[PDB]
Each structure stands twice: as C-alpha cells, then as structure tokens.
C-alpha cells in the first residue's frame, strides 16, 4: 500500500500545482493528454489500488479477500468488506473520470 | 449602484500611492550588498556519512556492546535435514522417504 498510495498523492499534487492550487475535481477534466506522465502514474496507481491482477496491490488485497471469505468469521463483517471493495473501484473511477477525461473545466490561462 | 464620484476619487488616489509603494519594493542591481566572503561529491559523502559512521558503530559494538552478556542476541540458524554443522562437522540425517505422492 505504501507504494501506490504515496504515488497517488504525488500525482494529485502534480495536478494541483499545474492548476494553481485548485483541488476540486469539478474544475479539472481534460488532463489525459495535457499531463501524459501524471496520467500514466494516476492510472497505474488506481489499478494497483483496485487490485488489478499482478500489480502491487493484487499481491495483498486478493490474498486478504480470499482468506476472509474462507475463514470462520462474522458474516456481516465479510459482507461489508466485499461491498467496500466494490466501492474502491467507484471512487477510483471518480478521480480518473473527472480529473482526466472530458473537456477542460479549469481557468483560461493554461 | 456604482461608486459615488467621491468614492472613485479616493480609490484613484490610494491606487496611485499603492502602485508607487509596490514599485519601491523592487531591488536595485547592487542589492543585497553582501559582506565580503557527480563522482567526487558522492565519494566524500559516502566517506563521511557511511564509512566513518560505520567505523564508529562497528568499534562500539565489537569492543563494548558485544563484550557484555546478552546485548546482541541472534535467532539461532535454522538447521535442515542433510545440513552440516561447521562447529563440529556433524551431519544431519535426511528425512525418511516420502510417500512420493504427486
């Protein structure tokens, strides 16, 4: 986790800096091609976070999930963990979709 | 809803002074008048920040810490069947033949 989570923060810091301290994803958009390297790091970091097979996050998350659902365990806890795993892909999509895709929504002096 | 003419005139007058104050904040060429005064750089850094520190630490551990009981305690080495002991030359027997299930 210490790898892709740190990268994600540096990737957001790269965007925040380029957009004069703007941190709201609603005023971002249209950065997929304007910031090619930040985009690549922000997509690699997100796939690792969401457990894309064989990225750094897959070697712990997936081992942890299969051990949870094959354990003698509280059933409600097991269900909350799985729904949360799904949520990880959702807000991960929010960052990519609103920061990188679409048309630019930031001020005119680029 | 705009400025009264009295408000405009005050803004104009303050603005003249402000822009003059901001202009006066610039440094002249001579300021600040200071009072009179990759391999190599990385090699000295290693010498002063690794080699000297490890010289002092190794001296400290070898001739002070390790001369007192139980200051440095190691997990003893794992011994697997078939290994040989350096201290005594003893030979550990192998594990009996497996079912050879596969």
């Amino acid at each position: 986790h210490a790898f892709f989570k740190a990268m994600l923060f540096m990737c957001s810091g790269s965007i925040i800096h380029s957009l004069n301290d703007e941190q709201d994803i609603r005023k971002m958009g249209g950065l997929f091609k304007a910031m090619p390297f930040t985009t690549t790091a922000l997509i690699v970091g997100s796939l690792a976070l969401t457990g894309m097979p064989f990225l750094t996050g897959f070697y712990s998350k997936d081992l942890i999930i299969e051990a949870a659902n094959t354990s003698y365990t509280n059933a409600w806890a097991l269900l909350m963990t799985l729904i949360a795993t799904s949520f990880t892909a959702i807000y991960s999509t929010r960052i990519i979709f609103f920061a990188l895709l679409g048309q630019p929504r930031f001020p005119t002096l680029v | 809803s705009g400025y009264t003419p009295e408000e405009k005139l005050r803004l104009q007058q303050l603005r003249e002074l402000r822009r003059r104050w901001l202009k006066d904040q610039e440094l002249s060429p001579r300021e600040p008048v200071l009072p009179p005064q990759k391999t190599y750089r990385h090699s000295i850094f290693a010498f002063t920040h690794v080699l000297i520190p490890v010289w002092i630490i190794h001296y400290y551990l070898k001739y002070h810490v390790t001369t007192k009981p139980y200051t440095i305690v190691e997990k003893k080495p794992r011994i697997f069947p078939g290994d040989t002991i350096l201290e005594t030359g003893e030979v550990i027997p192998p594990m009996k033949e497996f079912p050879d299930q596969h």
Binding site: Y72 | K75, K76, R78, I79, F80, P81, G82, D83, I92, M95, K96, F98, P99, Q101, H102
Partner: protein, 120 residues
C-alpha cells in the same frame, strides 16, 4: 456456502457442528482405518524452527521447500517446484477435511432417518 443456508435456515439437526466435529466414533462404518503417517520427526521441525501452525502433516514438503529457498539465494525465482509440492500436499490435506465434514453430515442424516424409521 449452501451448507450455511441449510444450517441457519433449514434443519440444524442434520448439519455438522463445525466446533464440535467429529461426533461419531472414528471407526463407525470404517473397518480397519489406518492412522495418518507423519514423515518429518519432531526434532526435525524443531531444528527447522517451523511455525507451529505449519507443523501439520505436510511439514516435510515445507522443510524441503525452505532448504531449497536458502540454497538458491539470490535466485528468488528458483524453487517453484518445491513450493508447488507443498501447496499440493496442503490441498490434499484440505480435501480430507471436506470429506470428514461430509461424512459427518451423512452420518447425521442416517441417524435422523433411523429414528423416523424407528418412531413408527
């Protein structure tokens, strides 16, 4: 699994209790059961310093894997064969427990039927 739906929503009497398994004698319906065979000795596992949860009936494959890992250094990609032998032995050890669960389930069903057949 379905086994949970059956126990919590259906008939808890003819579902094995995971905590109290097994409940029938080991030899009920098995003429001449053999004991499980342990390869590695207690001293060998003590010397190899295996974690206690790893000192099961598959420990000899683990000790074989651990020695190769140490000899193959720094080739950390070696020993893929030894690792698999250990994984597979632990897979067979797991299926055995599934069989024990199912045997307990079927015995609990037989006991139930033997009553209704007997109740009348």
């Amino acid at each position: 699994g379905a086994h949970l739906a059956r126990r919590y929503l259906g008939d808890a009497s003819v579902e094995p209790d995971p905590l109290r398994m097994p409940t029938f004698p080991p030899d009920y319906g098995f003429p001449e059961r053999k004991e499980r065979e342990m390869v590695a000795t207690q001293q060998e596992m003590n010397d190899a310093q295996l974690v206690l949860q790893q000192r099961d009936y598959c420990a000899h494959y683990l000790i074989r894997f651990l020695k190769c890992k140490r000899d193959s250094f720094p080739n950390f990609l070696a020993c893929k064969h030894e690792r698999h032998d250990w994984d597979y032995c632990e897979h067979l050890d797991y299926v055995k427990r599934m069989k024990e669960f199912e045997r307990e389930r079927r015995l609990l069903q037989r006991k139930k039927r033997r009553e209704q057949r007997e109740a009348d």
